[PDB]
Amino acid sequence: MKASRLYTLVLVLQPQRVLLGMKKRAGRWNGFGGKVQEGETIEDGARRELQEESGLTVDALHKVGQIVFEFVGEPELMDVHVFCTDSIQGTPVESDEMRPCWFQLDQIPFKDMWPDDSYWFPLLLQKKKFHGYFKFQGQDTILDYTLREVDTV
Ligand code: NA
Ligand code: NA
């Protein structure tokens, strides 16, 4: 089994809308996140990346899933810990690398999101926790995947 590198992903999910960020430098909408750093808990890394990438703070996040990504031709797995919050402080801020935008929950831009999101995002919306794994060839093609609803992430 490959080694894995820890990443976070944060979905700001309100009753009627979700906040996503368009990768500028690319072209897909995503939640906010990045690599976990030495000496921080995963949840604190998720809060830090949300702030660094969107400007938003939150004192707390809820863990809702975990997704492992494997890319053909790459040595490591990405181990992505997925969090959500409904409660925000501040306005999101655009950067040179990310543009934040709200989407109504009947206009989730799945066609402009990574392909895996079509599978697990619906579970998140139903308040269901999940474990996933996706193997990609490049950015467009899934060769294998697993997904399961879990009671405990
Ligand atoms: Na990032
Ligand atoms: Na994704």
121 Cβ neighbours under 8 A, 6+ residues apart: 108, 110, 113
- Residues flanking ion ligand 2, Cβ below 5 Å: 114, 116-117
Q: List, as residue ranges, the binding site for Mg(2+).
A: 33, 49, 52-53, 97
Cα–Cα separations (whole angstroms), residue 26 to 17, 99, 123: 23, 11, 25
Ligand nearest to the CA of 49: 1
Ligand 1 centroid to Cα of residue 21, in Å, is 10
Q: What is the CA radius of gyration of the chain?
A: 15
Q: Which two tokens stand for residue 142?
A: 């899934």
d(CA 142, CA 135): 6
Method: X-ray
3-class secondary structure, 44: helix
d(CA 67, CA 101): 23
